[PDB]
C-alpha cells in the first residue's frame, strides 16, 4: 500500500517535548517571493501538509498567498530534475538560511574595499581558502612524555 502518509510514523511525529500547538512566530514570519524556505512537516497541522518527500527539501517561494506559501522544489525523477510547485501552509515552512554564509561574506567583502577608499590601503584577498598546508612551527619538546604500547589485560 502507498497512501499519502505511508511510512511517515517517525517523520510526521512531534519532537519529544515539542508536542502541541506551535510558536506563533510561524504565523508572524514575513516571507518574500524568491526567499529560500526549508520544508519541515508538523504532525499537528494537517491542512497544507507536504508529502514525506518534501520533508527536508529546500526551495524558493514563487507565490506569497493568503494562508499558504507556494514553494518550487527541484525533485529528481529518473534522469530529470523537475521543478515541483507545492503550496504549503505556514506551519510546515521555515525561513531557510542556505545563503547566510554568502550574504555575510558579500557584505564583509565590501568592507575591505570600503577600507581601501578610507585608511588601510592594502586589500585583503577576499577569495575563501581551503585550509592549505600547516607550515613551519617551533615546538618545545622539553616536556616530552614517552608513551608506550602496554600489556594486554
Amino acid at each position: 500500500s502507498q497512501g499519502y502518509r505511508c511510512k511517515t510514523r517517525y517523520c510526521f511525529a512531534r519532537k519529544f517535548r515539542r508536542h502541541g500547538m506551535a510558536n506563533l512566530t510561524t504565523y508572524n514570519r514575513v516571507y518574500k517571493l524568491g526567499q529560500y524556505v526549508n520544508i519541515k512537516v508538523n504532525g499537528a497541522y494537517h491542512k497544507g501538509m507536504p508529502h514525506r518527500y518534501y520533508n527536508g527539501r529546500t526551495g524558493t517561494i514563487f507565490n506569497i498567498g493568503p494562508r499558504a506559501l507556494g514553494v518550487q522544489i527541484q525533485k529528481r525523477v529518473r534522469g530529470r530534475i523537475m521543478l515541483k510547485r507545492i503550496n504549503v501552509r505556514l506551519e510546515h515552512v521555515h525561513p531557510s538560511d542556505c545563503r547566510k554564509n554568502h550574504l555575510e561574506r558579500v557584505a564583509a567583502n565590501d568592507a575591505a574595499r570600503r577600507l581601501a577608499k578610507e585608511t588601510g590601503q592594502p586589500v585583503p584577498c577576499l577569495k575563501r581558502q581551503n585550509a592549505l598546508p600547516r607550515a613551519a612551527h617551533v615546538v618545545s619538546i622539553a616536556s616530552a612524555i614517552d608513551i608506550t604500547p602496554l600489556k594486554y589485560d
Binding site: 527541484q74 534522469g79 530529470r80 530534475i81
Partner: peptide, 11 residues
C-alpha cells in the same frame, strides 16, 4: 547508470 548517462538534466 542509465539516469546519469547524459542526465541529471537541469529544469
Amino acid at each position: 547508470r542509465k539516469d546519469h548517462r547524459n542526465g541529471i538534466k537541469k529544469p
